[model samples]
Target: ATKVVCVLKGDGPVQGIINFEQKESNGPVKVWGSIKGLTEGLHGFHVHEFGDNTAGCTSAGPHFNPLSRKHGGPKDEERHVGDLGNVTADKDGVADVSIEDSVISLSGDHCIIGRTLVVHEKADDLGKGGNEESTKTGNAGSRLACGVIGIAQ
Candidate 1:
């Protein structure tokens, strides 16, 4: 139905760009983008409830969970809409990220426009880590970078 974009930046050491696109309500969200300056590993990516980053990424609020669900991987039906899982960075510290998603939409009440796209410091455990933090925040460490998702042509 629409396309959106976000430019990620961190207070410490992270920078990247990401994009999302979908053609119809029933169609999957085609996320394609690149991120750089990361360690050689996976990073958690999610849509936060707010677009505000005035106070820093810490102010991005909780994961965009309009349905009020626990955290899980992208494949889990009981997951939050923001549960985008992980994007792995290669040895050179860059990741070409892409994933087919249905929970993230550009139109309708569940829309992600004006939300925060945050790349976290560690791999999300997908709620399988058997810890309280895993079920709540996937045990993903701190926010490394954050950006606002906005309308795109």
Candidate 2:
């Protein structure tokens, strides 16, 4: 199994940490992660392109859409592969996020170790009530904070 860990930093009501695990099970790839130190609210989350955490989160570039597909919901048919959807923070401001990718890989073009994780200020529309790519990023509001994904030991 391949694992990636990320430390989230931002000037929001809370700070967060994220970890992603990718392993080959059965056939498709298994992906999962957890979050801590977050505010009790909703946040938009996704795998970005660049690992550059320079601008905090903006430097991470767009979503990890290798296919240049439009931004859509996590499970949308025409959405980017990096779209992990929204993760809600519990009343204690903590969230446990997990997912499984049937078309994306942990390595190669879909590899996300060097990518970034973003926490948005608003809820994602799941690409239904937003723009052309409503499913993409849910037309979620601005980035409240972000972190880059790194390799885990």
Candidate 3:
């Protein structure tokens, strides 16, 4: 099992971080982690390439999709690697997110260990309805927040 660490340190209204554990035994990468210090509501979260923290999260760039796959639902089997879906925060702005991703791994060079996570000001629709690529990362708009994923300190 491999771990992805997330650190939240910015001037954003709310800040939070978590660690995503990748289960190699599973078909896809199994992620389990918790986030704190956030607003009371739903926030759009995703994995992004580049740890460019200087941009204040904007430098994280788009989802880590080197495959060039179109943005689709998490279960679509044909979507970006960074599209791990969304995690909802309760009234305390805290939540636990866990999902399996087949595309991500820690052993191979295609690993996502040193990636990033961005929290949007809104919720991902899960591509249920809206946008041509409905399945795509909910088309969640801009980056309301963000953090970087790294090895556990």
Candidate 4:
């Protein structure tokens, strides 16, 4: 399997590691991560459009929507290539979740390598919210942390 690791960025106590793994060619990629020092709630998690972290998370640009589709959950028929949905934190201020996503790839134009993985301050509504930003970004709030996606050796 080929693995991609994202080391989050932040100046606060918030920090974590997100790992994406592709176990088979043209198969689903496994997403797993653990985060700490966050509020007890849902947080938007996605692959941003750019890999540049020179200026921190904001430099990562928007979501990686190559198909020009609306923002939605991972299972949505129409959604950005980067939309993997939300991660929930427990009362203890830690979050850990795993997902098998078919929409992302580790190669070709759809590849997520070199992209940026971002963690937001609010939950992504998964396109259920009635608003323009919801369709564009799921209304996910301010970025909390971010990291570049890199291949694991």
Top model by lDDT, which number? 1
Q: What would the per-residue lDDT of candidate 1 be over residues 1-153, giving only the tens digit for each residue?
A: 588999999987678989899999757899989989888898999999999999989899999999999999999998999999999999998989989998888887678899999999999999999989898899889999999999998
Q: Which prediction has more favorable lDDT, 2 or 3?
A: 2
Tens digit of per-residue lDDT, candidate 3, span 1-153: 666677666565556666667656344666766766666666667778887888687788877787887766567677677776777778777767776767666656457777787776666666665677455557676676677777763
Report the lDDT of model 4 for residue 69. Answer: 88
Candidate 3 residue runs with Cα over 4 Å from true position: 23-27, 37-41, 132-137
lDDT of 4 by residue, 59-115 (tens): 999999988888999999988999999989999989997889999998777899999
Candidate 2: list runs displaced more than 4 Å. 25-33, 36-41, 133-136
Model 1 RMSD vs true structure = 0.9
Using TM-score as the measure, name the better of candidate 2 and candidate 4.
4
How well is each residue in 1-153 modelled by candidate 2, as lDDT tens digits?
776677777766546666656666323555555666666776778777888877677787777899878776667777787777788888877777766656555677667767777877777776677466474567767777777777788
Model 1, which residues run further than 4 Å from truth? none
How well does each candidate superpose onto the true structure, as a TM-score?
A: 0.97, 0.82, 0.80, 0.96
Error of 3 at 53 (Å): 1.1
lDDT of 4 at 95: 91
Clash list (residue pairs), candidate 4? none
Sort every candidate by lDDT, greatest first: 1, 4, 2, 3
- Which prediction has more favorable lDDT, 1 or 3? 1
Pairs that clash in candidate 2: 39-93, 71-136, 72-135, 72-136, 73-135, 127-134, 127-135
* Least well predicted 10-residue stretch by lDDT in candidate 2: 25-34
